[PDB]
Amino acid sequence: PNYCFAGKTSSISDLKEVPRKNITLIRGLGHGEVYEGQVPLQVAVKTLPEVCSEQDELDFLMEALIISKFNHQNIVRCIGVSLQSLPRFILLELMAGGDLKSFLRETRPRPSQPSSLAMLDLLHVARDIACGCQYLEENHFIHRDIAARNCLLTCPGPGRVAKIGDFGMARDIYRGGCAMLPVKWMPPEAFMEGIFTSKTDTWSFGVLLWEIFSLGYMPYPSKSNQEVLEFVTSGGRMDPPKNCPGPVYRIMTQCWQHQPEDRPNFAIILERIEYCTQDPDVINTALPIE
Numbered sequence: 001p002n003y004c005f006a007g008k009t010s011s012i013s014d015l016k017e018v019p020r021k022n023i024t025l026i027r028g029l030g031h032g033e034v035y036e037g038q039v040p041l042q043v044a045v046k047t048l049p050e051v052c053s054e055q056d057e058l059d060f061l062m063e064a065l066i067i068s069k070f071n072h073q074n075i076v077r078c079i080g081v082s083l084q085s086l087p088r089f090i091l092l093e094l095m096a097g098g099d100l101k102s103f104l105r106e107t108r109p110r111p112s113q114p115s116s117l118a119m120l121d122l123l124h125v126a127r128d129i130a131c132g133c134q135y136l137e138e139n140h141f142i143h144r145d146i147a148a149r150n151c152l153l154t155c156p157g158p159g160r161v162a163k164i165g166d167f168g169m170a171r172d173i174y175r176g177g178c179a180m181l182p183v184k185w186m187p188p189e190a191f192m193e194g195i196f197t198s199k200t201d202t203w204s205f206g207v208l209l210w211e212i213f214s215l216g217y218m219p220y221p222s223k224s225n226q227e228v229l230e231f232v233t234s235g236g237r238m239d240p241p242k243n244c245p246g247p248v249y250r251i252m253t254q255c256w257q258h259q260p261e262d263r264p265n266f267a268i269i270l271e272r273i274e275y276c277t278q279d280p281d282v283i284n285t286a287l288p289i290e
């Protein structure tokens, strides 16, 4: 099974095989299973269950090829693989800040920590992911699942850098059911016609922006997948998250334009995030205290 990215072909032989003896698992991180490990290089170890089908094996190899071929500061690095021993491993850059979805919920301003997060922290996370999305767009790669659950943070503190850390949906499409599709992150032409372009990621980026500025709420509060599908197809859009500055909400509503041609590309999105970052009326807005 070969892989093509940016018109360059790669195969399992191009993956960096790390000797199994050099790898130590330290603790579980979540669910196959994921561990924090060591090679010393700190890594996140993605495992392939030994009890798997041949399709699961090919999917695992395809995931390794996809991540290893990217080269961008906002896309998780692949340290290598351990495919010559069972269970097979994919070794990723250990993102000590964990997933973005959990970070937003755990780091929400509270009476004990009123300034735990500010608008600038959120704008920096949005810029970081938009930079990763821009890299994918300029290399003609469609992510198909831009969402907070798929983003990682280098550290919990102010110097944190956000990165795209999962490419499962893209791997599946490269090569399954409607109840597993990320309906709440998809534009109308994607769930209706199965039409995917770089403008599909623009729409999903708008939804991720809402997730960031809501501090980790599930999109379309109280709506099921089919309710969202009918709502979005009929022109319905989410309200601004609590205390969301107008200029930031305006980026979201532009990402959610019905026609893909009316949605901005990632260069324009980055330009608009930069302007929000400069505006004192935006960054001086206090986040809600839960």
Ligand SMILES: C[C@@H](Oc1cc(-c2cccc3c2CNC3=O)cnc1N)c1cc(F)ccc1-n1nccn1
Pocket (backbone or CB within 6 Å): 029, 030, 031, 034, 036, 044, 046, 076, 092, 093, 094, 095, 096, 097, 098, 099, 149, 150, 151, 152, 164, 165, 166
């Ligand atoms: C495959 C996995 O990758 C990583 C995960 C983490 C991580 C994640 C959560 C907590 C903590 C850490 C680290 N320490 C924590 O406390 C760090 N770095 C990674 N490379 C991943 C990639 C993604 F995009 C989304 C989710 C997951 N995930 N979360 C669990 C299982 N799977």
